[PDB]
Design a protein around this motif. Structure first.
Motif, PDB file in Angstrom:
ATOM      1  N   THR A   1      52.179  45.341  37.325  1.00  0.00           N
ATOM      2  CA  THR A   1      52.623  46.526  36.601  1.00  0.00           C
ATOM      3  C   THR A   1      53.364  47.485  37.523  1.00  0.00           C
ATOM      4  O   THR A   1      54.399  48.043  37.145  1.00  0.00           O
TER       5      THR A   1
ATOM      6  N   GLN B   1      47.227  42.028  38.125  1.00  0.00           N
ATOM      7  CA  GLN B   1      47.837  42.732  37.003  1.00  0.00           C
ATOM      8  C   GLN B   1      48.319  44.113  37.422  1.00  0.00           C
ATOM      9  O   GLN B   1      49.416  44.536  37.044  1.00  0.00           O
ATOM     10  N   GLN B   2      47.509  44.836  38.197  1.00  0.00           N
ATOM     11  CA  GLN B   2      47.932  46.156  38.653  1.00  0.00           C
ATOM     12  C   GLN B   2      49.171  46.059  39.535  1.00  0.00           C
ATOM     13  O   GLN B   2      50.110  46.853  39.394  1.00  0.00           O
TER      14      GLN B   2
ATOM     15  N   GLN C   1      42.513  41.373  37.960  1.00  0.00           N
ATOM     16  CA  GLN C   1      42.782  42.790  37.745  1.00  0.00           C
ATOM     17  C   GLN C   1      43.740  43.319  38.801  1.00  0.00           C
ATOM     18  O   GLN C   1      44.688  44.051  38.490  1.00  0.00           O
TER      19      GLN C   1
END
Lengths: 270, 54, 54, 54, 54
Positions: free
Chosen positions: E36, E32-33, E29
């Motif tokens: 992004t 991924q953050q 997670q």
């Protein structure tokens, strides 16, 4: 398009699961009723019941039979009768493409069904307690054909010097396809469940002539043809309900197999 | 990747949640009733032999 | 005596051993809770990353 | 027993599975937000480009 | 005894170790953050520089 087909197949499989479960519950109630009726039939065979309490037990059995008919006729999954023979061999789509299906079968449970019992043969010549099997004639040979088509022959040898009741017990012990018994007058009642016979039951042996046994097409008796006002009635009723319980258990096992296959199929489809 | 119209991970989570819920319901039934085999689905031969013994 | 033995056998085949099934029930409860927790984390972030991308 | 089975089937056909529908709700929410963002981006750029040219 | 040992071995091989996999999930997670955020930063700066040059 395949995903939509899988949605349809899952919905149909779930509907089949529900119908199977409803039929299974009704069959469970029917087999419980049959167990109670077996208990009543065994109780009536007792030799201390004069006449009136036999009538009471017969009334109880008649009520139980009416309950069996009611449950057979009424069980419905919203207007779809399940155990009255209307279901037949239905079909359920089980996949995305056209051609994969499972044929759901539900045989009727009515007390008039021919699988709900079988053939009965009654000895012509009654034998009292004093009589015993003569040592001269002891061989007793049965020959018949089972429903599955495999012919069967038995050569039961009766131990000398046993009264008719002990002969019935021995014949019961020797083999499972039979349920021998004795009525009030001591006439041997040989019962063969419907799946266990198909054709003419033929008998031989000197003992068969001595007892007056005459194996033939037999009297066709299902659960609806049960009367427990007589000892022989009680015994042949025990046999009839045993065969009927076997048939009901086979049907429930088939429904359970269908349910398991449906569960596996729905998991695979998901 | 980083899709919108389809959520495969959510689908797998839903499938496993459904399996867990089904097993939970079966276990709850077996606990409440007191019998392990209440319907033929739980066991065919087991149910047959149990009925005969009863 | 025969009824005693038959009852024992029938219980063995049918009766549910409460220890095994209560353990299974607790395991299924844990699995359901875990599946719900993952689904909550799977239905929101993977779908919601795009709005951050914009 | 029949009522229990019928209620189970009725819930399965009619009653919604909250996992699937909550996932659908979140997906629709995100799609709506993406649509609003895209509409805001697309309302200003085209009309403004020609005015810039002039 | 054999079933207990075999179940333990199967748990060692198949069954997930929740600590390791939850840590991996949190790390994923986070990654991924970060991805992004970096992609958003890279989306507008390098290209917008040329437009700023004009």
């Amino acid at each position: 398009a395949q995903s939509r087909g899988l949605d349809v197949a899952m919905r149909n499989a779930n509907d089949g699961i529900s119908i199977a479960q409803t039929a299974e519950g009704a069959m469970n109630e029917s087999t419980s009723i049959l167990q109670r009726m077996r208990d009543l039939a065994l109780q009536s065979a007792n030799g201390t019941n004069s006449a009136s309490e036999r009538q009471a037990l017969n009334e109880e059995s008649v009520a139980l039979q009416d309950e069996l008919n009611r449950i057979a006729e009424t069980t419905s999954f919203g207007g779809r009768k399940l155990l009255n023979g209307s279901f037949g061999e239905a079909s359920f789509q089980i996949g995305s493409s056209s051609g994969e299906a499972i044929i759901m079968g539900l045989t009727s449970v009515r007390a008039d069904d021919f699988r709900m019992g079988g053939q009965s043969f009654i000895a012509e010549q009654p034998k009292t307690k004093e009589w015993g099997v003569p040592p001269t004639a002891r061989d007793l040979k049965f020959e018949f054909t089972k429903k599955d088509g495999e012919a069967v022959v038995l050569d039961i040898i009766a131990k000398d010097g046993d009264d008719i009741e002990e002969l019935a017990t021995y014949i019961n012990g020797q083999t499972d396809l039979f349920k021998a018994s004795v009525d009030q007058e001591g006439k041997l009642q040989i019962f063969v469940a419907e799946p266990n016979i198909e054709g003419n039951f033929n008998i031989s042996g000197g003992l068969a002539t001595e007892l007056g046994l005459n194996g033939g097409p037999g009297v066709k008796t299902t659960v609806q043809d049960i009367d427990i006002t007589s000892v022989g009635g009680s015994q042949n009723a025990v046999g009839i309900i045993d065969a009927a319980l076997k048939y009901v258990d086979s049907q429930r096992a088939d429904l359970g197999a269908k349910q398991n296959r449906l569960s596996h199929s729905i998991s695979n489809l998901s | 990747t980083i899709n919108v119209n389809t959520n495969v991970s959510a689908m797998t989570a839903q499938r496993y949640l459904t399996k867990a819920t089904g097993e939970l319901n079966t276990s709850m039934e077996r606990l409440s009733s007191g019998n392990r085999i209440n319907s033929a689905k739980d066991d065919a031969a087991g149910l047959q032999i149990s009925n005969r013994l009863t | 005596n025969i009824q005693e033995n038959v009852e024992a056998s029938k219980s063995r085949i049918k009766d549910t051993d409460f220890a095994k099934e209560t353990t299974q029930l607790t395991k299924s409860q844990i699995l359901q809770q875990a599946g719900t927790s993952i689904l909550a984390q799977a239905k929101q972030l993977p779908n919601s990353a795009i709005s951050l991308l914009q």
